[PDB]
Structure 1
Amino acid sequence: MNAPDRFELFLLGEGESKLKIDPDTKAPNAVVITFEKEDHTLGNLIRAELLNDRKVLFAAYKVEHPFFARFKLRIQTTEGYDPKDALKNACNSIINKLGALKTNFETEWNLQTL
């Protein structure tokens, strides 16, 4: 009766962006991006690849409350290198590993029998 229609898990509401980006007041060269209508299947990937990048000091995400579909990823990087890039380079680096995955699988699947 108070229940929140499923679809508010993946559809954005109103006046809401798929990202709000904000500067961490604590450190320098630090940033905490919000991720509306998302979760672990997405946060957890971003971070851990964001940790292969050797020019990143800090990276983490947090589902603040499972009632809602958010998750905040905070990213701190070397002098100069603005984090949006670290996000970028990493974001891509996955697309790639995924692009091969598809194909490499594609190759193997075609070879089996049954």
Structure 2
Amino acid sequence: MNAPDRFELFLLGEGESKLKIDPDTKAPNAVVITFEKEDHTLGNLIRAELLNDRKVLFAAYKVEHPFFARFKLRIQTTEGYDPKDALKNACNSIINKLGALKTNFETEWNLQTL
């Protein structure tokens, strides 16, 4: 009875946006993005990518409570490098990578017999 609708895990409600960017106070050049209707799939994936960028000083994410399909991601970058851009790069990379993978897999699949 007190259970929310399953579709509330992926479908944004009213006034909710996939992203919310609040400036971090504790540290400089730090930001906290809030992803709505997203779980670890995207969360742990982007923290991974973001951590290849030697200009990324800090990067982690957490889902404060498993009842709510949402998570925060904090990103600190070196001075003069907008964390937003840091996120944009990681995302592109995550794609180009999946670009290659989708390609290579189909290829390989076409040589298979059965």
Please indicate, yes or no, whether the TM-score normalized by the shorter chain is above 0.5.
Answer: yes
For structure 2, the residue ranges without an aligned partner over 5 or more in a row are: none
RMSD: 0.5
1:15-46 deviation digits (Å, cap 9, x = unpaired): 11111100011011010000000010110000
Cα distance in 2 between the residues matched to 1:95 and 1:53: 16
Cα distance in 2 between the residues matched to 1:107 and 1:61: 35
TM-score norm. by structure 2 comes to: 0.99
1:2-25 deviation digits (Å, cap 9, x = unpaired): 000100000000011111100011
TM-score norm. by structure 1 comes to: 0.99
Q: CA deviation at 1:76?
A: 0.2
For structure 1, the residue ranges without an aligned partner over 5 or more in a row are: none
Runs of 4+ in structure 1 over 3 Å off? none
1:54-78 deviation digits (Å, cap 9, x = unpaired): 1100000001000001110000000
Q: CA deviation at 1:96?
A: 0.4
Q: CA deviation at 1:87?
A: 0.2
Q: CA deviation at 1:106?
A: 0.8
SS of equivalent residue, structure 1 residue 45 = helix
Q: Which residue of 1 aligns with 2:50?
A: 50
